[PDB]
Amino acid sequence: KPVQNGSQLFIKELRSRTFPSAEDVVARVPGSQLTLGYMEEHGFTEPILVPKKDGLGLAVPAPTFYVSDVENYVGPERSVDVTDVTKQKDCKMKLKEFVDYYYSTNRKRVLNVTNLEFSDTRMSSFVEPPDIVKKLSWVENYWPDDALLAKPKVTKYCLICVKDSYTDFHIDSGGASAWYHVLKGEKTFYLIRPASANISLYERWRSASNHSEMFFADQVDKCYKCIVKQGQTLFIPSGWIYATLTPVDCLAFAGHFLHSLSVEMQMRAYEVERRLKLGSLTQFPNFETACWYMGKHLLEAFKGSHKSGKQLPPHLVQGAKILNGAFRSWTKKQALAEHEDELPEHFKPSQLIKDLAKEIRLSEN
Ligand SMILES: O=C(O)CNC(=O)C(=O)O
Ligand SMILES: [Cl-]
Ligand code: NI
Structure with a gap:
């Protein structure tokens, strides 16, 4: 019988699989060492994990900042995209409704909020992206502050995931690179290198009618498991194909950015997106x-x-x-x-x- 990705069964199976450790590919780097020089020297070709905030110039709330607070500073009436993990289908609802689900027991459903961009809320002031992202970012550096087109609204996301939630394999929109900071709980990333055949495999899988019944990692050479714990910041390079599992309730912040070290990968991911003709739901605006x-x-x-x-x-x-x-x-x-x-x-x-x-x-x- 075909197993749907995200289903209870699927997660039980996923938790039992062994993956190559990201020891091989993910560098561990002190915050004050993640400089433009380091980036230019290494080329940002592999994910980077920064175990402690120190030196990143990352501003984020104390870990004693909960989902209930998100509700206050963002707005309980804010409309938000909620992902029903079990159906791998999406829907909209007031934040207050999600937060009410979040705090209930017993939770029947498995629902996530992973598209909540809050740079237009009061909570915006509580979060500042790392200094290195500001240095690398095309928008930050080259988009004039008095432009008539609005800057891409992709710089501040709040991710709220319940235990046993799963985000399926994908390349972030525009081939954008990401910073991803776990404030509370932890997040498991399954990371796939954007080798040419892997990208081609991904496009074919992603557009097959039955993709949500196929585990993509079974199709590639190596899928690396990286667990990002509380207080750690993961940086994901352009084009990486990845999925996530949430082993415990997780609150995280993230942002997406383009930069000059991956112009080619950015264009290629963009071209892949173009052909897949997916929902503008997650697209990289402008x-x-x-x-x-x-x-x-x-x-x-x-x-x-x-x-x-x-x-x-x-x-x-x-x-x-x-x-x-x-x-x-x-x-x-x-x-x-x-x-x-x-x-x-x-x-x-x-x-x-x-x-x-x-x-x-x-x-x-
Ligand atoms: O939070 C998750 O597990 C999924 N997040 C993303 O894939 C992202 O921020 O781009
Ligand atoms: Cl950018
Ligand atoms: Ni993503």
Whole structure:
């Protein structure tokens, strides 16, 4: 008999499986050591676990900040996406209704809130992303504060999961990288490397009518188990395919960001998303716009490289080429209609592409 992902049975089985430890792949790093230098030296190609907040410049509430508080600072009448884990189906309800379910006994259902972005609430002031995320983030660095398009609202999520909840394998929208901090409880991540065949396997699995009856990790070479405990912060690189299990009631904060070390993976994940035609529910809003602003940054970085005769690092040049190809793809007569909606004001894509192409040729000398 086919077992639904997320079902009691499925979790009992999952808890019994053995996985390779993330000892192999996930670096343990002191907060004050997670610098742009470390990132640039290692390339952010593997998840990073920071055991203690110290040095991250991460601001989060004391661990004595409960779901009941979330209800207060966010708003009990706030509409929120609740995931029914057993049905692996979603629905909407007032926060107050979820929080009421959360505190009941005996809980019949297994429900999660994993899409609750609170940067537009009073609770926003209680959480500040780590310094390294602010340094890496495209939006943070290159999106003008007076822009007419709203910044992507993906920087502050509150995740509330009950014991025995399960989030199925996925790549985060836009191939965005993530910071994920467990305030209370713990979270188990099953991490899959975004090797080319793994990505291809994921796309095929994710679009099969029966994907919620198939355990994706059975299809890959290695699925690493990483347990993130209370107070620890996990950073997930671009493109990683992953799932989570919640062994005890968990409260966590997370944020998503794009950056210059994974321009290719970001575009490839985006392209995968495009084809899957999934719900905009989790999509990375104005992903294209972020890329546009990055493209203008690169142009300026190139022009600035001429005043000093100093080259731009190879990853930026390659990045520029990938972005430029995207820009061209997005501004094709036919395509302009769909993608113009994310074009920043006062942008002339033609001159941008031309100027970038030219400036890439020059660096290719
Ligand atoms: O909290 C969970 O278990 C699931 N969270 C995510 O997959 C995420 O924040 O992108
Ligand atoms: Cl970003
Ligand atoms: Ni996710």
